């Protein structure tokens, strides 16, 4: 039940030192410290030599931010653990999550504090018992941080944090871990190491199973008879960006939705790009003007996904709000729990962004455009996500 990660990394822990923690229980800080010590002892290359080594730093945040120690301060696990033990919580009267994230981006990973080595994965583990209520706006700071190639894991403790805020901050919604008490932190260790050791890269030549789940309502071609073809061209252009299709590379499937959902083709129907693109083009729209986003996702879950070890992706496109036959929140949750990464795109003024946000793996994976002609504007960003390939590297000690 104890694991390790052999990945070379610079790891920053963002450690809430708000007064709420001390008020709740005088032993809470010790339990937080112990948890962080256990993290240190989970990374095998911490304390290694020179260029094959991992580093650890800790930054306290509540009212303002204090660096407990930088990445380059200590050189062995023991010394790092002593550093953690010697930390003095400040018991601030505010919780500035965003200011913490900003400090980490601007200082913690800088050359001056020992960061910047390109062979190293950058990881931030945030621990908080509160909601951000002052300082730099957190969603924006989290965006800039992650844009620099930083993985963000968020741990929420007790009843005072808000889960959707942590979900916006973390790399994906399932990089958020929650527990009811500081006493149970240790039950999250394996999960945190598993996420920290998840290596995600952009690789359009990898093995992936990709499902387009798209709107085929009569509404699409209402204000412009080109819309449906523009949407097909967008999907065909995405297919063309993969190096190789079929069982030896990338497999594609299509599900469409209107009042209900229909599997047009599964992952094993076609192996050539020409066949995949021609199959996309043959798909006909419904004469019904409903959009069953929930049914589309259910269909992908039950009829498309059940290749093993391969990255699974759903790219969903809609021009309307859900009809309620199935719950998009529930169906997407089930898909994401199975390892499916979900990208959500709304086109026009008929969709609801809340629903896109509910189904996507992250609000960073949500895209909106005013028209089908402007799908080209989001193409590059969508491809980078469609090509994302995540590999778990943690294993038992
Ligand atoms: Zn190992
Ligand atoms: Zn607090």
UniProtKB/TrEMBL annotation:
Bridged cysteine pairs (disulfide): 5-197, 200-390, 204-387
Keywords: Metal-binding, Zinc
Signal peptide: none
Short name of any one Pfam family annotated for the protein: VWA
Alphabetized InterPro entries for the sequence: ECM_Assembly_Org, VWF_A, vWFA_dom_sf
Domain (VWFA) ranges: 10-192, 209-382
GO terms of molecular function: metal ion binding
Source organism, top-level taxon: Eukaryota
Modified residues (N6-acetyllysine): 374
PROSITE patterns per the UniProt record, alphabetical: VWFA (PS50234)
Residues annotated for Zn(2+) 1 binding in this entry: 4, 6, 395
PANTHER family documented for this protein: COLLAGEN ALPHA (PTHR24020), PH DOMAIN-CONTAINING PROTEIN (PTHR24020:SF20)
Name used for this protein in its record: Proximal thread matrix protein 1
Source species of the chain: Mytilus galloprovincialis (Mediterranean mussel)
Chain sites annotated for binding Zn(2+) 2: 16, 18, 20, 129
